[PDB]
């Protein structure tokens with residue numbers, strides 16, 4: 001069988017929390033008044049929710065209302081408990097209220113409003129300094145939720161909401177987030193395709209916070225190289241092949257051999273043999289102003305096959321890449 005794995009940090013955070021903290025199935029939802037909020041316009045519809053701009057008529061403030069699609073009670077409770085646990089943390093989206101939507105008959109989560117610009121437009125005007133600044137802000141959120149025993153599991157540009165005017169950032173959509181428990185096996189069907197860690201792609205279930213760091217690395221690569229997404233696979237199998245064409249196949253085999261993992265035999269005729277590439281390969285005259293030795297080394301230390309070998313969020317915040325970022 002597979003060799004077991006443990007997070008190298010925050011390993012027993014939940015072990016020593018009171019059970020109320022992580023036992024979300026037993027959580028009792030405290031409901032607000034649904035008539036406090038008025039839907040103004042629909043912003044989007046995902047697989048698990050519909051998102052609306054709204055007004056809180058008790059203060060005439062703009063808010064965001066996320067009306068959950070019918071889904072098993074524990075997943076709904078999971079997201080709620082996680083949001084309440086993390087509320088007030090650095091750059092964590094603030095859950096303001098929970099109400100029962102009369103039409104859907106499901107919980108509607110009320111969030112603080114973030115005046116966002118579309119990431120595709122934003123990622124295209126971001127300066128070298130902007131990228132470092134916002135990366136640092138994401139790291140604050142990730143070290144926080146990891147230190148609080150939670151992995152996000154869906155880090156991607158769409159879930160990093162940025163108000164570029166006030167240089168304000170929020171990590172959103174905690175619907176896939178989970179509590180980390182040492183040696184627990186998790187569903188590998190998480191994260192968006194382009195941001196899936198190698199551990200998910202090789203069906204290794206005993207993963208941890210370090211998954212989020214691979215996803216963050218994918219975001220970084222897309223930003224500094226101006227290629228979104230960076231690893232652009234057509235499906236989950238091609239996704240691993242795309243990664244192997246950059247990181248190389250010999251380190252992939254070292255990875256799966258270390259945890260005594262076996263690849264899907266489906267890869268036998270599509271994976272091939274590939275050398276590890278140097279990151280300078282992806283540098284050109286249209287992105288070189290976003291690239292530095294510090295950037296490439298930081299990226300290199302995020303994008304590792306071995307989840308145990310990736311920088312932790314805290315380690316990442318110590319990296320020379322962030323030396324130029326103004327501290328508060």
Ligand SMILES: COc1cc(C=O)ccc1O
Pocket residue numbers: 046049051064066093111172173174175
């Ligand atoms: C799609 O999930 C979310 C969306 C938003 C705002 O767009 C805020 C919090 C969320 O969890």
